[PDB]
Amino acid sequence: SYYIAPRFLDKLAVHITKNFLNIPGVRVPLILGIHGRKGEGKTFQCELAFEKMGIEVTLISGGELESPDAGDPARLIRLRYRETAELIKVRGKMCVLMINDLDAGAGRFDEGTQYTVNTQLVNATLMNIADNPTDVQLPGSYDSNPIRRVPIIVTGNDFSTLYAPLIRDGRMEKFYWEPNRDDKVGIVGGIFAEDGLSQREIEQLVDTFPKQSIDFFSALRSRIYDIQIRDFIHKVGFERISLRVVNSLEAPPEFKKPDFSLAHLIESGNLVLGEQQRVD
């Protein structure tokens, strides 16, 4: 029931549609890349959009091709591209392959500041697919028969300089997604829709923290049981909190549905602000 921003949906629609469409005289970028701040919800929006459209999605982890002890990215991206192409025929629906954190989540500090051998391989593989999308080749069992072209989505914080050729060529399209007031109200409104908050209340939350990530507001819901747990500990007592809960056959702890008010959310908001401030 989560809200999707109209702009985000439009950018996905046009890219997927145009690639699948067969209009002569027209050139289309195969790869689309989205860069934004962390916890903006780029991954979350992509997954939602595909469900509404009903189009099949193949997901490849950023850490799956960044790790030295994983395999071969060059052999992997090719294999995933072929498999996605098979879905269109069998499934009879549009199929898209997307990558998350191409230059991130590896564990390395640089985050694309310094290139790696593995970084070079992805660039090489992607460039080959973008030039010749219709024909993609594995090491063995070369097939003469062409494959249906498949659109690619990529999300990150920023794009490396190695990709600059593709963008100048116009083979890659870069979309910068930043939330607005209207977008915030939608997303915040969707999260707390089940709780039941007035329109005026939702506006106040966004106004309290004008410059905040989308992830923060979602994280606020989690710290509602804290008061109950803290109070519960006292009745049981510190001496034997562990034993009863960890490995004892008794009735499981029961918590009444937390009351939802704006005051509680502001108090919780301040605490997370303070902690983030001190850490950075």
Partner: protein, 86 residues
Amino acid sequence: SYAQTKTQTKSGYTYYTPDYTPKDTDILAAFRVTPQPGVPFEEAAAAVAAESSTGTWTTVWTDLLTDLDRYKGRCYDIEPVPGEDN
């Protein structure tokens, strides 16, 4: 911009090889190769050396119980044919 030079500490721990020098006890073969359009020269040569020897692109549990470099044919030289395309 700020560039630096460094010293470092180290933790520590496949068919086309042009660096290899042929032995006096080796069987050598010359092929006149014609690939399909959209196939590289070094890729086509590596495919011939693999398929005429052991093949084995994917490693299985049986393959790890033996040496892989010991029983393997390799391409060491590529020469173009004059006045001909691909």
